[PDB]
Design an enzyme around this catalytic site. Structure first.
Site, PDB file in Angstrom:
ATOM      1  N   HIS A  83       0.701  -1.321   0.169  1.00  0.00           N
ATOM      2  CA  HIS A  83      -0.031  -0.038  -0.041  1.00  0.00           C
ATOM      3  C   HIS A  83       0.933   1.221  -0.084  1.00  0.00           C
ATOM      4  O   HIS A  83       2.115   1.145   0.082  1.00  0.00           O
ATOM      5  CB  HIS A  83      -1.028  -0.049   1.018  1.00  0.00           C
ATOM      6  CG  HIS A  83      -0.445  -0.006   2.580  1.00  0.00           C
ATOM      7  ND1 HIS A  83      -0.021  -0.782   3.197  1.00  0.00           N
ATOM      8  CD2 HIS A  83      -0.606   1.033   3.236  1.00  0.00           C
ATOM      9  CE1 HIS A  83       0.272  -0.524   4.326  1.00  0.00           C
ATOM     10  NE2 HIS A  83      -0.090   0.801   4.334  1.00  0.00           N
ATOM     11  N   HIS A  85       1.480   3.569   2.130  1.00  0.00           N
ATOM     12  CA  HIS A  85       2.154   4.329   3.203  1.00  0.00           C
ATOM     13  C   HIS A  85       3.802   4.055   3.453  1.00  0.00           C
ATOM     14  O   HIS A  85       4.393   3.202   2.504  1.00  0.00           O
ATOM     15  CB  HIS A  85       1.572   3.778   4.745  1.00  0.00           C
ATOM     16  CG  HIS A  85       0.157   4.249   4.784  1.00  0.00           C
ATOM     17  ND1 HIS A  85      -0.897   3.632   5.631  1.00  0.00           N
ATOM     18  CD2 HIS A  85      -0.715   5.442   4.324  1.00  0.00           C
ATOM     19  CE1 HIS A  85      -1.973   4.449   5.502  1.00  0.00           C
ATOM     20  NE2 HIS A  85      -1.780   5.472   4.783  1.00  0.00           N
ATOM     21  N   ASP A  87       5.794   2.727   5.406  1.00  0.00           N
ATOM     22  CA  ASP A  87       6.360   1.612   5.722  1.00  0.00           C
ATOM     23  C   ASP A  87       6.365   0.655   4.546  1.00  0.00           C
ATOM     24  O   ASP A  87       6.830  -0.430   4.604  1.00  0.00           O
ATOM     25  CB  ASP A  87       5.943   1.135   7.135  1.00  0.00           C
ATOM     26  CG  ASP A  87       4.409   0.870   6.873  1.00  0.00           C
ATOM     27  OD1 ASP A  87       3.626   1.449   5.823  1.00  0.00           O
ATOM     28  OD2 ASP A  87       3.777  -0.132   7.746  1.00  0.00           O
ATOM     29  N   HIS A 148      -7.485  -1.413   5.520  1.00  0.00           N
ATOM     30  CA  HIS A 148      -6.528  -0.349   6.262  1.00  0.00           C
ATOM     31  C   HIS A 148      -6.122   0.742   5.398  1.00  0.00           C
ATOM     32  O   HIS A 148      -6.210   1.768   5.889  1.00  0.00           O
ATOM     33  CB  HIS A 148      -5.118  -1.231   6.690  1.00  0.00           C
ATOM     34  CG  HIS A 148      -4.004  -0.335   6.927  1.00  0.00           C
ATOM     35  ND1 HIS A 148      -3.742   0.014   8.123  1.00  0.00           N
ATOM     36  CD2 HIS A 148      -3.137   0.281   6.174  1.00  0.00           C
ATOM     37  CE1 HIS A 148      -2.708   0.721   8.170  1.00  0.00           C
ATOM     38  NE2 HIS A 148      -2.385   0.932   6.794  1.00  0.00           N
ATOM     39  N   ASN A 179      -3.167   2.936  12.842  1.00  0.00           N
ATOM     40  CA  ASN A 179      -3.469   4.059  12.053  1.00  0.00           C
ATOM     41  C   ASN A 179      -4.618   3.664  11.024  1.00  0.00           C
ATOM     42  O   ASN A 179      -4.482   2.764  10.186  1.00  0.00           O
ATOM     43  CB  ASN A 179      -2.216   4.187  11.311  1.00  0.00           C
ATOM     44  CG  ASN A 179      -2.430   5.506   9.962  1.00  0.00           C
ATOM     45  OD1 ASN A 179      -3.450   5.962   9.957  1.00  0.00           O
ATOM     46  ND2 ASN A 179      -1.407   5.425   9.229  1.00  0.00           N
TER      47      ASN A 179
HETATM   48  C1  LIG Z   1       3.700   4.383   8.788  1.00  0.00           C
HETATM   49  C2  LIG Z   1       2.639   3.331   9.320  1.00  0.00           C
HETATM   50  C3  LIG Z   1       1.706   3.163   8.160  1.00  0.00           C
HETATM   51  S1  LIG Z   1       0.876   1.415   8.445  1.00  0.00           S
HETATM   52  C4  LIG Z   1       1.754   3.714  10.475  1.00  0.00           C
HETATM   53  O1  LIG Z   1       1.082   4.790  10.344  1.00  0.00           O
HETATM   54  N1  LIG Z   1       2.257   3.578  11.530  1.00  0.00           N
HETATM   55  C5  LIG Z   1       1.947   2.272  12.263  1.00  0.00           C
HETATM   56  C6  LIG Z   1       1.921   2.661  13.836  1.00  0.00           C
HETATM   57  C7  LIG Z   1       2.783   3.662  13.841  1.00  0.00           C
HETATM   58  C8  LIG Z   1       2.865   4.484  12.493  1.00  0.00           C
HETATM   59  C9  LIG Z   1       2.243   5.619  12.561  1.00  0.00           C
HETATM   60  O2  LIG Z   1       1.051   6.011  13.331  1.00  0.00           O
HETATM   61  O3  LIG Z   1       2.548   6.830  12.001  1.00  0.00           O
HETATM   62 ZN   LIG Z   2      -0.552   1.827   6.259  1.00  0.00          ZN
HETATM   63 ZN   LIG Z   3       2.032  -0.270   8.527  1.00  0.00          ZN
END
Ligand SMILES: C[C@H](CS)C(=O)N1CCC[C@@H]1C(=O)O
Ligand SMILES: [Zn+2]
Ligand SMILES: [Zn+2]
Ligand SMILES: [Zn+2]
Length: 233
Positions: A83, A85, A87, A148, A179
């Site tokens: 996706h 984001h 990560d 998600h 998130n």
């Molecule tokens: C960068 C990723 C994308 S799933 C994200 O949103 N996370 C996972 C939990 C912590 C971090 C965030 O909240 O920014």
């Molecule tokens: Zn994500």
């Molecule tokens: Zn993630």
């Protein structure tokens, strides 16, 4: 034996062999003073490797490539981001500079562009409609529907019965929503059911963050998502 967030200093990546020819990669990032782990996948593709997701950032992804080179010693020729984001696409430029052909669905590429994130080079056709699946070498890519995120893909390795759920699937230790800014809460349970229906034989289920488990992770995620959906204001 699975690497945990306290066992991986930020900037480092660990590999974990799930099955023959299947590894997860585990990296960490700090966010708001807490440190979070993140998983991706590596799948042997003949004498090459298919990478699923970056290691969450340019530095981590450089460390990922170095760790793969050291531990596996086969070239990463293709990468799929599941996706849009960071990560999942953060580190695309590092992969591209290292000769990896980077891929994502047009949905992911469009959303990554809107977000100002890195954009994989290639477009994966045939995944725009919920329930669409396409083969990509040693994996099947499946778009289960919005969950998600609207573009989230899951990845199945049929030879190993490994289901990589990405961030659409929560680890068991997560009992409240993560998130959800880009989530489709209303569709997420139906999307999870599509995953269950397509891969009921899955033996290992890898969440986007945290410890692998079994198919129990699917209903667990549905429970957490529904609990969040019904949060009382
Ligand atoms: C960068 C990723 C994308 S799933 C994200 O949103 N996370 C996972 C939990 C912590 C971090 C965030 O909240 O920014
Ligand atoms: Zn994500
Ligand atoms: Zn993630
Ligand atoms: Zn649960």
């Amino acid at each position: 034996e699975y690497p945990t967030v306290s066992e991986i200093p930020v900037g480092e990546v660990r590999l974990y062999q799930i099955a023959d020819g299947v590894w997860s990669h585990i990296a960490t990032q700090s966010f708001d003073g807490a440190v979070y782990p993140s998983n991706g996948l590596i799948v042997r593709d003949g004498d090459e490797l298919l990478l699923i997701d970056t290691a969450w950032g340019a530095k981590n992804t450089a460390a990922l490539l170095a760790e793969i080179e050291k531990q596996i010693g086969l070239p990463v020729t293709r990468a799929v981001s599941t996706h849009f984001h960071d990560d999942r696409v953060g580190g695309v430029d590092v992969l591209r500079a290292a000769g990896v052909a980077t891929y994502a669905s047009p949905s992911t590429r469009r959303l990554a562009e809107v977000e100002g994130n890195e954009i994989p080079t290639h477009s994966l056709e045939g995944l725009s409609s919920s329930g669409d699946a396409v083969r990509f070498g040693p994996v099947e890519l499946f778009y289960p529907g919005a969950a998600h995120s609207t573009d989230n893909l899951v990845v199945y390795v049929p030879s190993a019965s490994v289901l990589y759920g990405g961030c659409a699937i929560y680890e068991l230790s997560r009992t409240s929503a993560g998130n959800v800014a880009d989530a489709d809460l209303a569709e997420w349970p139906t999307s999870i059911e599509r995953i269950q229906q397509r891969y009921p034989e899955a033996q290992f289920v890898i969440p986007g963050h945290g410890l692998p488990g079994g198919l129990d992770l699917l209903k667990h995620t549905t429970n957490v998502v529904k609990a969040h959906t019904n949060r009382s204001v």
